[PDB]
């Protein structure tokens, strides 16, 4: 498409974290905890719902692929001793971080779930 980008509104954040993880194959982590991310991007907020092994292996790959800093552990503890924004905070973190490193939300993500033009939850805001 061909628009001016005049509304560069950015906000990524992740606004949930809840137990309703879709559960996979033998997978190192299978954790059934899913945390709910929301990326706006040029005034469109997504919300998608992601098992941590979905970033865990996004991250992994494109670590070798385009700049990227540190990646999530393969070993994570069971959550009882911090609190949720703990994952919360270091994928979005990271999340963030290769979004204002260079391909912003990766195009693989976007291939990955069909994150072009996603929706978004009424639920994922706090006053709006």
């Given at each position: 498409?061909?628009?001016?980008?005049?509304?560069?509104?950015?906000?990524?954040?992740?606004?949930?974290?809840?137990?309703?993880?879709?559960?996979?194959r033998?997978?190192?982590?299978?954790?059934?905890?899913?945390?709910?991310?929301?990326?706006?991007?040029?005034?469109?907020?997504?919300?998608?719902?992601?098992?941590?092994?979905?970033?865990?292996?996004?991250?992994?790959?494109?670590?070798?692929?385009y700049?990227?800093?540190?990646?999530?552990?393969?070993?994570?503890?069971?959550?009882?001793?911090?609190?949720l924004?703990?994952?919360?905070?270091?994928?979005?973190?990271?999340?963030?971080g290769?979004?204002?490193l260079?391909?912003?939300?990766?195009?693989?993500?976007?291939?990955?779930?069909?994150?072009?033009h996603?929706?978004?939850?009424?639920?994922?805001?706090?006053?709006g």
């Amino acid at each position: 498409g061909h628009h001016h980008h005049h509304h560069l509104e950015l906000e990524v954040h992740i606004p949930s974290v809840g137990p309703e993880a879709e559960g996979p194959r033998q997978s190192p982590e299978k954790s059934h905890m899913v945390f709910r991310v929301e990326v706006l991007c040029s005034g469109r907020r997504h919300t998608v719902p992601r098992r941590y092994s979905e970033f865990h292996a996004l991250h992994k790959r494109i670590k070798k692929l385009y700049k990227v800093p540190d990646f999530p552990s393969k070993r994570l503890p069971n959550w009882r001793t911090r609190g949720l924004e703990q994952r919360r905070q270091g994928l979005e973190a990271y999340i963030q971080g290769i979004l204002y490193l260079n391909q912003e939300v990766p195009k693989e993500l976007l291939e990955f779930l069909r994150l072009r033009h996603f929706p978004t939850d009424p639920k994922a805001s706090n006053w709006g």
